[PDB]
């Protein structure tokens, strides 16, 4: 069981973890410390209704929200791309397949990292300075009230797997090396890498999660839920076009949504 081949998989897990720490300053451990109220450095303010929203103040509306959250996500996309450079074999793939892998993968990784910011009560905002409640978000007028609730539904179940940053480093690498993306030119060298990452993930979860039989399968099922969240955005855009009701939104709420995804 401990042999040259398993040692190589442990080495790959550590290489990915080290690169993950270098690439992503916003770790899961950091997010959870704030959520469970462990960090006494300027604790986050809770925004749970319109009155607290106003006390928290420190070209359709929805389209502007999406333009703004995509702009605020540029740094995350850059961090993800830097991380992908550290995955052995990735930079040797055809450049167009590297771009294709990242253009679909970044959205799923952003949602994975957004889950770290979420619990059943709400989500961290304003660089950890604020906490926006789930039920306040859900209470807002259509179509805005429906934006975030399926991501909370995903995050609560995802967080119950109790993955740590060591796990997440390999899981995110597996997401990037998805051989089933549309428009990929050479699928086999991608699959070759992903199969090695999958072996490394399998071993990592056995060593790190004695409590969870079928955790490997359950985590692979989550990749299915991530893709569905992304494709639900197309439907959300259609709901916005169709919407024949007032879609005005408080500017502070617009600002909060631009911090989400």
């Amino acid at each position: 069981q401990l042999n040259p081949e398993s040692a190589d998989l442990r080495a790959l897990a550590k290489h990915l973890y080290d690169s993950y720490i270098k690439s992503f300053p916003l770790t899961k451990a950091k997010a959870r410390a704030i959520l469970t109220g462990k960090t006494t450095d300027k604790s986050p303010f809770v925004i749970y209704d319109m009155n607290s929203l106003m006390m928290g103040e420190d070209k359709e509306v929805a389209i502007r929200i999406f333009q703004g959250c995509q702009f605020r996500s540029v740094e995350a996309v850059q961090e993800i791309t830097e991380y992908a450079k550290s995955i052995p074999g990735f930079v040797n793939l055809d450049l167009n397949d590297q771009v294709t892998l990242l253009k679909y993968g970044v959205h799923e990784i952003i949602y994975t990292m957004l889950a770290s910011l979420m619990n059943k009560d709400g989500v961290l905002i304003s660089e950890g300075q604020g906490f926006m409640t789930r039920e306040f978000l859900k209470s807002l007028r259509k179509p805005f009230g429906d934006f975030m609730e399926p991501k909370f539904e995903f995050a609560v179940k995802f967080n119950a797997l109790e993955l740590d940053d060591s796990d997440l480093a390999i899981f995110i690498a597996v997401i990037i090396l998805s051989g089933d993306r549309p428009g990929l030119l050479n699928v086999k060298p991608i699959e070759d890498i992903q199969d090695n990452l999958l072996q490394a993930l399998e071993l990592q979860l056995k060593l790190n999660h004695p409590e969870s039989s079928q955790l490997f399968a359950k985590l692979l099922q989550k990749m299915t839920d991530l893709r569905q969240i992304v494709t639900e955005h197309v439907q959300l855009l259609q709901v916005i076009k169709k919407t024949e009701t007032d879609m005005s939104l408080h500017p502070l709420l617009q600002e909060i949504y631009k911090d989400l995804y």
Partner: peptide, 13 residues
């Protein structure tokens, strides 16, 4: 998104 592909292509440089 062509803009997103642009950001990725430059970060890959």
């Amino acid at each position: 998104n062509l803009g997103l592909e642009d950001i990725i292509r430059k970060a890959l440089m």
